Design a protein around this nucleic acid. Structure first.
Ligand code: MG
Ligand code: MG
Ligand code: MG
Ligand code: MG
Ligand code: MG
Ligand code: MG
Ligand code: MG
Ligand code: MG
Ligand code: MG
Ligand code: MG
Ligand code: MG
Ligand code: MG
Ligand code: MG
Ligand code: MG
Ligand code: MG
Ligand code: MG
Ligand code: MG
Ligand code: MG
Ligand code: MG
Ligand code: MG
Ligand code: MG
Ligand code: MG
Lengths: 227, 46, 122, 201, 95, 95, 72, 242
RNA sequence: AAUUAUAUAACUUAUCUAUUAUAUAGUAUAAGUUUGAAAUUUCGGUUGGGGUGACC
RNA sequence: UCUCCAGGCAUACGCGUAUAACAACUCGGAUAACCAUUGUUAGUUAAUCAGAAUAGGCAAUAAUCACACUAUAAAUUA
RNA sequence: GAGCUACCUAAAAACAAUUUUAUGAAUCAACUCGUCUAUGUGGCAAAAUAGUGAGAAGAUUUUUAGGUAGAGGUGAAAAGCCU
RNA sequence: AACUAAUCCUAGCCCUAGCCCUACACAAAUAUAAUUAUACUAUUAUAUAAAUCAAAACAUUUAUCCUACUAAAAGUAUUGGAGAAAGAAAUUCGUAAGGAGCUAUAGAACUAGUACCGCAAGGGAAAGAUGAAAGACUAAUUAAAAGUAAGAACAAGCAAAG
């Protein structure tokens, strides 16, 4: 009887009501422990493909206007409503984004380096080595999947030929084509790691059930009389 | 606490748990009815 | 402790449970919950004029009862259809194609009262 | 019900519903089955008592309980009882008849009064008639008053009773039209609309 | 022992007797001596001679073996050139 | 395919009967797996001229994978049945 | 029509009036006029149950006539 | 009590009463006959006699086929008689070790095969054995037509046989249209398998499919008794006039 | 503890495809090996009773 | 009429005639009176209480007297 | 078999007065719980009564419908709970 | 000098023989929370039987269970921790309505799959007795069980025996 709530085909900026799982799967059995209850929430459909040209428009760099930078219950970072042309779409907000700012979304692969302004989306080839980036996509057109948390910025270590190396926040180096689009700057809510829960009830407000109260080298034969 | 009152009646719950439509939903439930028909039960299901 | 043997009716169960007692529907429920009764769906009692009717509920005990001969298709056919076909055959004005002339109906479609599937109540 | 015992009192009477309540489980009575054809005793037939208290005395049948092979004769095989007994009053002494089985009686030849055994045989017209085994002779079926008390000859119809001739009037005219169509045409109802397609299934 | 078989309703022979003992028609049973093929290097010459012999069974042992085998193993067998032809009967036996 | 053998003997059933099997007769061992057998070649008569095999009408032996995947599917070769052999043999004689 | 129900019996089915054809009705297609093989055992048990009743019924009538013939 | 007939005879008695009796005689023969499939998963005994090594005497030998489980997925492809062997093994191949459940599975491939008689290419789930059988039969069409139902062991395969047989039986001009010569060659090549039109129709039908076909053939709405009596009256009147 | 263990994981050889100059890829399966989620079974004897020892 | 006690009336869920009158005085109420028992006859009334056309396009801005006021757990067919 | 109970999902409810403040704060009802003693021990009760107590705007309590099932489920681990 | 009680005979049942079946019965309702006159949401068995138990434990194994004609070949050949046990074939033979059964604690559980118990799957009773006639007023028969009553007891004791 479990029908997923993620059944909306068409993009909208209206917040969408979420049904909670409880750590259980479509079978009805717990698959992850420690999830339950909490505050009711609404899902605002984020758009991680920064360079999405508007319908019936050409594929070239465009600009959008930041309406508001808002708190999002469903993620560590904060979201910014951005409007351009006749389209409104939620997006992740960088560290310094404010209302009324203008942010560029560029398709052009700069043959030379392009000056980097935080919040604008540029292909990795355009950016210069060393620039802090966020919302990186693995393959051109996929959409952003890495560096999407609060205050998490990766570095662009190297660009050679058609590919570049990205240092993910975990210090794990990844390689992607220079065509991939990465947003510049940090991801905002840099102090999220400084937040203090304080009381056990606060985690029960975020849907975190308490931990359960339940409290390997086989010797080789030649080394069993010394164990 | 005092036990013995584990039955909290509800017609919606009863017909959903042990009703005609529920029994026919799975083949094992159909065989529940087949046994009771063979035995001669006056009540096949709730 | 529920009663498994008594009949399930609308008096039992919560308010949400409702079901009919066997009365035929006379209308339709539109959206926004408006009942619209249909005049044609409501039965009409066709009552004859009984003025000057000689038949009353009971019969004379002196009246002889008759031997039972339940009606058969052959008896109906002979009483009604045989006289025409027999006379027509002698006249020679007979063919298989014109069976409608004697009262045959190839199909029941289009008739107000269809003999099969029956479309009228008693 | 397999346990209902048939008695002299008519089935369904107050006495019968007390003699045969739903919970009674009395021992079955053994009855030699007799074919409807074989049985030859009828109400109003004079019979003779072969054996018993009144053996050799001829009487008239007045009742038959076929399930018990019983023939009851008026004024014979009589014991005595009080009818209408009340707390204040004794009642009235009367003689009550008791059932006699078929094999304890025989039918009587009309012209010569004797217990003649009879055999069933047809006639020229084809109607089945009883014939005496010896002194072959037609024993006519007697006439008995109707059980409900209705004598047709004396009957005079009151209100709500159809007269004879009216009941026997023939008005049916055979035609290939149902009762529905006939009434509408006679009463002049007109309907030109036709039912839409219905998918029977 | 199987006294009544499911298929045939009879007793069954214990095929461990049939593979170890010979029954003479008179009623006697022959056997070997346990260990006659074992560790012969450390056995005395007299001991080995005793082991090689065919030996008879006691009254109770014979009674047991008769219970464990069926009648077919107790019939008289007319084998041409049998080397036990003369041992199937008793002679000069008063007892 | 996989060929299996029963571990336990099955008693004979007779001319017109089927043997009754028991739970112990469901235990098997693997005699052979035909996958690992040496693989024979396939013989086809060409209907065209294809490089590195020969001219139309010749008889060749080729790996089964090659024969089915390319020659037979593409129509280059036809099955070397006795009927096909006669037809192509006649053509060569006339040629 | 004559149809077999999900319990393995043969029952006469009386048709109903609908405004749409049968292949388009979704309430009609939930009704099943077939029995799955797990009903086969129950089919045999009914026949054997009925055979027992009839055999008992014949036996009793024979016994009853013996009582009649002894009595008469 | 007892049933009159042994339970194993019940299926034969069912075919012999009711609408099943009215089914074609030739079709019933296919239903009645039982033939063992050609051995696939066991080696058959070459001879009917063998010399026992232990006692050195001649003893009879018989072939007992392995029980093979045919998943319903197989009926939608062409497995060459192969199936699943559901059995047990002895760990380490000694009968004094534990008995372990074992399942041997066929290696299944997806292949595309062309039928000349149908002039269509089908994509089928197939085993290497099935491909070998076709090669031995010198054509995909020959494989289906030659192989019997028991060896074929596929409802999809049997339906192919009916189409091929029906195609040949009617000499349908729907094959390679506009090319009577090309068509003629194909029909001539497979002339050995031609059978009468009536028989070919009932090839590969299951008992339920056959019964529905028979019910459809004899389905007829009743005759209005008006006509029936009219026929009788006319015949009587005409006969009297004679 | 003994006996197993197509639970997962891995490799190896075949089988089947792709390619390639022999070759590196994959793999509706079979046969091995490694790992062990599990499964099945058991708890010799004599010694005011319990450590160890011992003994048969 | 007096003396004294202090969860009552509705609805939901559930129950299924225990409802009311009469007649009975066996069974049932842990005893009587009387009936909750037995038999017979009756009953609960609703357009407001309560239950039961199609296809597209689109949504940033809580609640709390909603103003001020901040906040955090970020929150309702048109 | 989850109408009890454990946990969960969805839709709904309840919290006076007083003091603090801006609260898993305080006093104390309704409500939830069950500390200590007595009565009871075939009892009113197969776990209650009478007192005395703990919490009482919260990890609170309650209602309705749904989910997870025995080689398993649930578990703020008592090997608790699953009529 | 009698209360409680007792007596009873047929309701049916049992095992065979024989036999394929063609019982599947008005109108209406019903797979919707079955038995609710019409659309909405469409509909679908199962991969190998396991274990107990026997082997005086248990670990391969353990008749029937898991059926293919009778009598013989034969408990033979064979198979097996060669133990417990298991066990063929070739071949031969073969033409056919009854009761030293039960009679109400028995015989079917059965007067009924009911009452009743259980949320459910499921479990599952007890009992009747006049006569030809009750349109003869529903009878009789029996120092007869334990239990009582008629009729409490009267120094002292396995309660009796001499
Ligand atoms: Mg811990
Ligand atoms: Mg209970
Ligand atoms: Mg509750
Ligand atoms: Mg034989
Ligand atoms: Mg009252
Ligand atoms: Mg009163
Ligand atoms: Mg009353
Ligand atoms: Mg309303
Ligand atoms: Mg619940
Ligand atoms: Mg308050
Ligand atoms: Mg507090
Ligand atoms: Mg307190
Ligand atoms: Mg406190
Ligand atoms: Mg808890
Ligand atoms: Mg602990
Ligand atoms: Mg319990
Ligand atoms: Mg044992
Ligand atoms: Mg075992
Ligand atoms: Mg009994
Ligand atoms: Mg009983
Ligand atoms: Mg006494
Ligand atoms: Mg004394």
């Amino acid at each position: 009887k479990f029908v997923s709530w993620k059944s909306r085909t068409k993009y909208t900026v209206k917040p969408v009501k979420m049904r909670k799982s409880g750590g259980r799967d479509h079978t009805g059995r717990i698959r992850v422990h420690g999830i339950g209850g909490g505050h009711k929430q609404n899902y605002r459909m984020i758009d991680f493909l920064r360079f999405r040209p508007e319908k019936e428009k050409a594929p070239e760099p465009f600009e959008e206007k930041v309406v508001v930078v808002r708190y999002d219950p469903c993620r560590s970072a904060d979201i910014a409503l951005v409007a351009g042309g006749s389209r409104k779409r939620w997006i992740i907000a960088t560290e310094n984004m404010k209302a009324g700012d203008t942010i560029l979304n560029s398709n052009h692969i700069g043959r030379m380096a392009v000056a980097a302004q935080e919040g604008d989306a540029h292909p990795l080839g355009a950016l210069p080595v060393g620039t802090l980036i966020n919302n990186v996509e693995s393959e051109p057109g996929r959409g952003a999947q890495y560096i999407r948390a609060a205050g998490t910025c990766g570095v662009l270590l190297r660009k050679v030929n058609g590919t570049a190396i990205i240092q993910l926040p975990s210090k794990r180096q990844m390689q992607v084509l220079e065509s991939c689009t990465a947003t510049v700057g940090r991801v905002s809510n840099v102090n999220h790691n400084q937040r203090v829960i304080g009381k056990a009830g606060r985690n029960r407000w975020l849907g975190k059930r308490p931990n359960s109260g339940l409290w390997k080298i086989r010797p080789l034969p030649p080394m069993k009389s010394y164990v | 606490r005092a036990r013995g009152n584990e039955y909290q009646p509800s017609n919606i719950k009863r017909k959903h748990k042990h009703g005609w439509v529920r029994r026919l939903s799975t083949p094992a439930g159909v065989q529940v009815i087949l046994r009771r028909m063979l035995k001669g039960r006056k009540s096949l299901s709730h | 402790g529920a009663d498994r043997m008594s009949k399930w009716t609308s008096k039992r169960g919560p308010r949400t449970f409702t079901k009919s007692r066997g009365a035929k529907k006379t209308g339709i429920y539109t959206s926004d919950r408006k009942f619209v009764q249909i005049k044609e769906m409501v039965p009409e009692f066709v009552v004859p004029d009984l003025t000057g009717f000689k038949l009353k509920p009971y019969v004379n005990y002196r009246a002889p009862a008759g031997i039972d001969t339940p009606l058969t298709a052959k008896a109906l056919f002979q009483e009604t259809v045989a006289p025409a076909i027999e006379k027509d055959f002698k006249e020679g004005t007979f063919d298989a194609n014109n069976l409608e002339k004697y009262g045959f109906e190839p199909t029941q479609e289009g008739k107000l009262f269809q003999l099969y599937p029956k479309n009228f109540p008693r | 019900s397999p346990f209902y015992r048939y008695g002299m009192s008519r089935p369904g009477s107050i006495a019968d519903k007390r003699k045969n309540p739903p919970w009674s489980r009395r021992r079955p009575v053994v009855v030699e089955p007799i074919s409807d054809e074989d049985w030859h005793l009828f109400c109003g037939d004079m019979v003779e008592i072969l054996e018993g208290k009144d053996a050799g005395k001829q009487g008239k049948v007045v009742q038959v309980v076929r399930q018990r092979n019983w023939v009851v004769l008026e004024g014979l095989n009589t014991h005595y009882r009080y009818i209408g007994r009340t707390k204040d009053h004794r009642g009235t002494m009367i003689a009550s008849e008791a059932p006699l089985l078929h094999h304890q009686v025989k039918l009587v030849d009309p012209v010569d009064r004797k217990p003649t055994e009879i055999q069933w045989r047809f006639t020229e017209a084809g109607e089945r008639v009883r014939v005496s085994t010896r002194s072959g002779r037609i024993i006519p079926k007697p006439e008995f008053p109707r059980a409900d008390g209705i004598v047709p000859e004396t009957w005079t119809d009151g209100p709500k009773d159809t007269s004879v001739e009216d009941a026997l009037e023939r008005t049916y005219v055979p035609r290939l039209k149902t009762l529905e169509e006939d009434v509408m045409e006679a009463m002049g109802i007109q309907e030109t609309r036709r039912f839409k397609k219905v998918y029977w299934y | 022992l199987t006294y009544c078989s499911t298929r045939k309703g009879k007793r069954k022979t214990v095929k461990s007797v049939v593979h170890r003992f010979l029954r003479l028609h008179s009623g006697l049973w022959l056997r070997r001596k346990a260990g006659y093929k074992k560790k012969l290097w450390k056995k005395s010459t007299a001991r080995k001679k005793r082991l090689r012999e065919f030996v008879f069974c006691s009254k109770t042992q014979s009674k047991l073996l008769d219970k464990m085998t069926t009648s077919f193993w107790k019939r008289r067998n007319w084998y041409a050139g049998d080397p036990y032809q003369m041992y199937h009967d008793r002679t000069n036996l008063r007892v | 395919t996989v060929i299996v053998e029963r571990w336990w003997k099955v008693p004979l059933a007779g001319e017109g009967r089927k043997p009754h099997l028991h739970r112990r007769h469901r235990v098997y061992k693997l005699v052979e797996d035909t996958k690992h057998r040496p693989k024979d070649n396939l013989e086809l008569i060409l209907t065209q001229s294809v490089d590195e095999i020969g001219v139309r009408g010749d008889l060749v032996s080729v790996k089964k994978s090659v024969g089915r995947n390319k020659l037979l599917s593409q129509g280059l070769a036809v099955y070397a049945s006795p009927e096909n052999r006669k037809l192509f043999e006649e053509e060569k004689s006339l040629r | 029509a004559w149809r077999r129900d999900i319990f393995g019996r043969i029952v006469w089915h009386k048709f109903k009036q609908w405004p749409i054809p049968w292949y388009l009705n979704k309430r009609y297609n939930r009704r099943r006029f077939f029995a799955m093989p797990y009903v086969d055992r129950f089919i045999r048990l009914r026949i054997e149950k009925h055979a027992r009743i009839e055999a008992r019924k014949r036996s009793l009538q024979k016994k009853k006539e013996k009582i009649l013939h002894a009595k008469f | 009590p007892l049933h009159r007939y042994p339970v194993h005879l019940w299926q034969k008695l069912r075919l012999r009463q009711g609408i099943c009796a009215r089914l074609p005689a030739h079709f019933l023969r296919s239903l009645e006959e039982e033939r063992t499939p050609t051995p696939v998963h066991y080696k058959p005994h070459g001879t009917k006699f063998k010399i026992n090594p232990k006692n050195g005497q001649r003893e009879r030998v018989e072939d007992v086929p392995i029980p093979v489980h045919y998943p319903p997925e197989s009926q939608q492809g062409l497995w060459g008689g192969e199936g699943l062997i559901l059995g047990y093994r002895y760990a380490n191949n000694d009968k004094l070790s534990k008995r372990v459940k074992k399942v041997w599975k066929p290696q299944l491939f997806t292949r595309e095969l062309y039928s000349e008689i149908l002039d269509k290419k089908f994509t089928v789930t197939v085993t290497m054995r099935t491909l070998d059988l076709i090669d031995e039969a010198y054509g995909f069409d020959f494989y289906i037509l030659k192989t019997p139902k028991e060896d074929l062991g596929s409802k999809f395969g049997m339906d192919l046989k009916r189409g091929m047989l029906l195609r040949l039986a009617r000499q349908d001009p729907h094959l390679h249209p506009e090319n009577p010569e090309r068509r003629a060659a194909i029909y001539d090549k497979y002339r050995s398998f031609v059978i009468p039109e009536a028989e070919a129709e009932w090839v590969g039908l299951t008992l339920e499919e056959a019964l529905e076909k028979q019910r459809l053939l004899e389905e007829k709405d009743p005759v209005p008794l008006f006509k029936v009596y009219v026929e009788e009256l006319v015949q009587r009147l005409q006969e009297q006039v004679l």
